[PDB]
């Protein structure tokens, strides 16, 4: 569905670095990224947001939902504010949660990459 091509990418990066990043780090609770060899890549800013959306908010076989976590709640708010039309689209097991959050941190690093 939603196409992140019209978002204010710079504002979303400022929001991530200001407040979301520290919450993913807190969630990871000392587990390091080298515990997980499989990573998820992305190719440009909207594609990164698409994958960020999917890993943050979609249930998976190994991680039922992260939607109530602080980093997720803050992600949702950032997308609601800075992606035109995003909020309209939102009106309607834990064994892989750390792996998933570690993958999210990598997707955000690529989102945040200097141009």
């Amino acid at each position: 569905m939603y196409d992140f091509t019209n978002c204010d990418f710079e504002k979303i990066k400022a929001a991530y670095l200001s407040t979301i990043s520290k919450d993913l780090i807190t969630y990871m609770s000392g587990t390091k990224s080298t515990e997980f060899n499989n990573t998820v890549s992305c190719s440009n800013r909207p594609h990164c947001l698409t994958e960020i959306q999917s890993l943050t908010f979609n249930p998976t076989a190994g991680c039922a939902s992260l939607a109530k976590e602080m980093f997720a709640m803050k992600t949702k708010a950032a997308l609601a504010i800075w992606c035109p039309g995003y909020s309209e689209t939102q009106i309607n097991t834990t064994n892989k949660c750390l792996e998933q959050v570690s993958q999210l941190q990598g997707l955000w690093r690529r989102f945040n990459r200097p141009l």
Binding site: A15, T19, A67, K68, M70, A72, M73, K74, K76, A77, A78, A80, I81, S87, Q90, I91
Partner: peptide
Amino acid sequence: CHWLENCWRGFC
């Protein structure tokens, strides 16, 4: 104003 569910209000 409609606040979304599970959505932080701190950017305001």
